């Protein structure tokens, strides 16, 4: 409940020094963080329960890996990303999440690697004095994730996503965004890419298409299978 | 199922059955504070939502049905929950309870603030009003009731403008400028709550406890507990009157 | 006709020190300031005639009260309010005027207490470097005027919109109404911002004189509602 | 006190048809409109006293000419100019007033012809959806007034800045001066924009009454320069 | 050598020796039009610049030294050349000559326009004046001279505002709105020319021939040639008086 | 000199139908277009002399390739790119050019592949109603260029560039742009990437660092050698 302590004091994360690995996966839902830690990591322990925003650390192929819930939207993920980087020395951050497709050639359960993110957040207009900053993924993470997707034979589109402030927007103008190549909507990536660049860290978002503005029915097994593939891409990207 | 293109009336972030949520609701940011409020102040409280861990509860206070729902942090998070509560569950009275950071020399830690309005650096309203200035404003009658309840309990209750921040960590908040024009404290949700409540003809108020000061007093766990309890009672009374 | 002297010099108000009470009513029409001063005040003296912008000081229930015309619009009232606060030490400022309603349940002759003011003026975007400041009334003034209106059995409380452009081709009134705006006028946002800046108490008490929908009264109707508005304002100022 | 009637209804000007000439001078002070009407016009009749905003119609060299007070600032002059053009058929509109100089080579009592007007008003950003409109004088009016000033041996021609905020904590005058702005006033941008909108001819003739640097005269000096400005304006209107 | 961080005074885009450029200069957009003007109207014209093919020439007109320099298209291109001409070569009088597209019913193809000012959708001045409205404006005395020269030749010469576009191909120009407020014609450079000329205390004017109309007349090669020649003579006379 | 004819009538390019290849290189300087066409292409012919903005078509490894000068700045390149795409059916556009580095670890003669471009142009703020669009390279062109740079052992950085309207800017704020990862300044890429995305075309900028805001002296031979390497990367990217 302190507001003016500084990000290096990380008041939203109750972890001791060292409990968070240099490489971290960022689902939005803390219950997905627990699923990832229990399903894919060895020896996972919980290091944070503040606000119920669970985070865990364990190992994957002998490399230390953390998984931290972020909440929804640019202001929530910006709190957690600032604290992870400035307080815990995190250097590689892979967001794993969903998105809503707006392109006719993108299908539900396709996996998208966000090369960059458009946004209607004000955060960068206020930093850059009204000019246009392009939040952009780390190229080597992106290229690595792409190569792993190839090894696994996945349907993998690479392009721009749109980071919305307003999940419920009366005037999204999706026809305009789609005309200019935007693949899908989500709510966090522009902030992740901007703050990772600010502090010299490496960031990527690996996203599953969970809805389409035009289209498609799926089952629970189907969803869990695609989720597992996205997590495996992220983990390999993190440790290579 | 992570659907993006259902309308708010389908409330995909809230797992409650129709009718499980009361028309009056308290909105702490922290789902663990929702659980504390429900267990401490409400009779017969039942959990209606665990989606994303963002707990919500319904119970009764002085014979009235009351819910209490975590919102998460920031304008985008609370705007999801408020849209769904209003458009899917028929919520009509929405009281945010939480903390804020004072930026005024004469506002003290543990003061309770009633936000009469909220400034912001969110883009949400610039995009709605094509670049003009909308003033997000509390419901007058809730605000007046809460103030009077505070008088009944001999409380302070400062009343004025708060600033809804997008960036908890901001390199350029210019707090001197905001303080100069009378902003009392920083928080991260009220501008969206007040705007959406006005949009749908609902009544909203934020009742906030000062938990930090840009220029400073330390406090005890018990002191914070009793001020917290006092904030909740003001909000609960404001909801049922 | 100076431009680069400070507000402590009172460029536009030809009074000298002490002639202006700490409580002031601000109609927009100077002829209406004269009316208020004669009709409601005991002992009304005219302290200003610069530009015809009449201002008067008198007594009401034994309290000193001034009444000062502002012009029309944010730049005009900003001149007078800066000089009133920074030159003459005015502490309590209550605007009284008319507004055009844009809500179906608000009727002509209803009285509005402006809790806050939206605007399309650039004044605050330029102060807060593009961010959103909410100009807001003093709460104790607002609450006082509300109880007075109740004691006298009258009163809607909410947001008004301060327009720069009386004649606007694109006002988008349906959007402002959707988000609760009650009525349009042209001064309150500047008053609430400047009052907060200098730690003064401000409030707008407004009478609906027109409606977007009904397009709308007798002379006797307008003046009776007007006097009720003044009575609320005078009361709020002295309590 | 109507709000939602069109400008063809002349809400703020209590004249009837034909009482206002097609050529009009626009001082900002209504008391100064009265002065102009008596001192320079033959047969001056007062056609308006709404809000004290006096307006007069008379003759000069056998041509009908009106003189109408505007208030201070873009919203005020916009009200009067809309009604003058759309109700009364005014075609030629010449503002006369003062300004504060921000250039070292411009001196108090110099007369400025405003070729164009910069501004910090939001009026045009909201019309042109954030793009940059340049409010500009009618060239033939500008050229005429320039030749008259020469015939009479007086005159700087350039850009002025129309301010919303007479009292501005952050005017950044060094930046505007670097880019050639001559002086600050508070109305010309709105006049030039509205004149162009309705196909009318407009011009501001301004007297420097203050300087950012010299901070600056006798009463006899101010009034003699003033009369010269009026003489230029009257001449430009009728030629 | 493609240096980005030398100051304008080093004029890396212009290969002229010190003094090879006259204090008075005509600025067509097209380097081939610069060459035509120099060879047709100037005595003793010599080429001083071929960097990027953006030809510039110096010669004499009626015993006065005059240069003529291609600018390229758009605010960023002309702003490079104008900064370097002013800050490196001491240019003081700058007359743009070129074409424009009319958007007014009463402006006709082959009319010659003197731009008294220029509207724009460039961001250049929003960023200089922190979001306020600067009006780029011609030098009054050049404008007046050109008008009078046009009278001497019995020419039309319309005088008013032009719009400096960033986007020759724009899906949303809103020409009806601009025409409503009196914009005569579209071009792509004048706002930058007038702003930079004011910045450095120089005198600038744009003299433009209407070459197209949003609502329409066809013309002959000879007709375009004689109107072109007439535009150049007005600009040359305006430069040396 | 027509203003209202429509981009498909391409009034700035005097080429007959078919004279321009589907794959094109875009130097800014028309004299560099002539150098590229004479040095690297077989059978090159000039198809445009309008405004002196030379363009050429020839062959490289048996594939048809064009080279077209663009002028300086977003408004100039936007005219040529609109006409090439809408009138001549160009589908793959590689800008080859220079840039001014602002990062201390980027050296003069390094080759930069622009993953995305920041800008202070107003063009996208006016299209997207004041929101933030991120102009982004085609991933497969980018990845291909990267791989070719590897085959050749070049010093190849991949990241964001800044597209300036004002070569001479009194307030560039380069410290802020550099803090957020911007590698270098140039004047065209944001427009190229936005218009290529609008029309479903593939675009990339391959840029040589020719100046540094902090630092380095070079020779003519050095410059020509690095220029040749950048052109070879672009040509391979275009035809693979
Ligand atoms: Na911590
Ligand atoms: Na639900
Ligand atoms: Na040079
Ligand atoms: Na063509």
Residue numbers in the entry:
A (entry chain A), F (entry chain A): -7 to 207, 209 to 233
B (entry chain B), E (entry chain B): -8 to 207, 209 to 233
C (entry chain C), D (entry chain C): -7 to 146, 148 to 209, 211 to 233
Sentences from the paper on this structure:
As part of our exploration of the biocatalytic potential of thermo­stable PNPases, we solved the structure of the N-terminally His-tagged PNPase from G. stearothermophilus (His-GsePNPase). The hexameric structure shows threefold symmetry through the ring-shaped hexamer and His-GsePNPase can be viewed as being a trimer of dimers (a/b, a′/b′ and c/c′), like other hexameric PNPases. The subunits of His-GsePNPase are similar to each other, with r.m.s.d.s of 0.136–0.160 Å on pairwise comparison. Each subunit is comprised of seven α-helices (H1–H7) and two β-sheets. One surprising aspect of the His-GsePNPase structure is the presence in the active site of several residues (NLYFQ) from the nine-residue rTEV site (ENLYFQGAM) in the N-terminal tag. This portion of the rTEV site was observed to be bound in the active site of the adjacent subunit in each dimer consistently across all dimers in the hexameric structure. The interactions between the active site and the N-terminal tag are dominated by the Tyr residue in the rTEV recognition site. This residue is oriented in a similar way to the purine-base part of the substrate.
